[PDB]
């Protein structure tokens, strides 16, 4: 996270750390949507151009972590994957369009004060909360800065970010933005910064329903041009836009 702060213990019970067995390394973020399914971006898994194609056995999902590095025993739980499902129409070729992926747990994960799922948005909530100016919150153990001169943070990081208008998003970049993406961050005019960085991808972009006090995942951290650059915005999978899909595999495959 660029310009964030140390999160609070228990602050993001849905926070999933997608771990790599050899080498032992942070790979991405993800979120716990149920006792069996984790939610992530496809790009953490499949990026042909980067020779990136991870399989059910390359990864380890550690939930309930706080510390970036320490094996937090009796607190965190390392779990094994059944299957990975990538959106059939994910577009790594052109705009990373449909950057979504479901990961299935080998066994149900026991909820604790540290392990708790976030909700998926419905039409009405998605409707009333997904509006510009409206601040979401991003969490992850990614980089503090785009490149670090002088995988960085001690603990899970936090940053709250303003949802930006389409046309603003579209002006920002040269990439073909789609209905399935959304952008966030402070305009170069608002003297305020922060963003998701490298190692923050696939993690959750959540906002709180002033109606029910529930926290909802509105987006998955996607692509961007560097981290925290003036005039550019961070891009996000439109979680509610792809719900028909989630809903579908989740019941095809249980």
């Amino acid at each position: 996270i660029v310009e964030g702060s140390d999160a609070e213990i228990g602050m993001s019970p849905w926070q999933v750390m997608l771990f790599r067995k050899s080498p032992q390394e942070l790979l991405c973020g993800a979120s716990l949507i149920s006792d069996r399914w984790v939610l992530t971006a496809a790009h953490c898994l499949l990026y042909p151009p980067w020779d990136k194609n991870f399989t059910e056995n390359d990864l380890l999902v550690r939930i309930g972590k706080h510390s970036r590095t320490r094996y937090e025993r009796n607190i965190e739980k390392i779990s094994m994957l059944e299957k990975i499902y990538i959106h059939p129409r994910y577009n790594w070729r052109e705009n990373l369009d449909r950057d979504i992926a479901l990961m299935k747990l080998k066994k149900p994960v026991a909820f604790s004060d540290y392990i708790h799922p976030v909700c998926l948005p419905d039409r009405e909530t998605a409707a009333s909360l997904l509006q510009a100016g409206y601040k979401g919150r991003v969490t992850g153990w990614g980089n503090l800065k785009e490149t670090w001169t002088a995988g960085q943070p001690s603990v899970l990081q936090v940053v709250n970010l303003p949802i930006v208008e389409r046309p603003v998003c579209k002006d920002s970049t040269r990439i073909r933005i789609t209905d399935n993406m959304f952008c966030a961050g402070y305009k170069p005019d608002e003297g305020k910064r922060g963003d998701a960085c490298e190692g923050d991808s696939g993690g959750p972009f959540v906002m709180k329903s002033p109606f029910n006090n529930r926290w909802y995942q509105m987006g998955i951290v996607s692509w961007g041009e560097g981290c925290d650059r003036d005039g550019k915005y961070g891009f996000y999978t439109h979680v509610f836009r792809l719900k028909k899909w989630i809903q579908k595999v989740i019941d095809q495959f249980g």
Binding site: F19, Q24, L26, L60, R62, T69
Partner: peptide, 10 residues
């Protein structure tokens, strides 16, 4: 930088 995780996970 990561601390080693219990072996049965690997």
């Amino acid at each position: 930088d990561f601390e080693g995780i219990p072996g049965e996970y690997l």
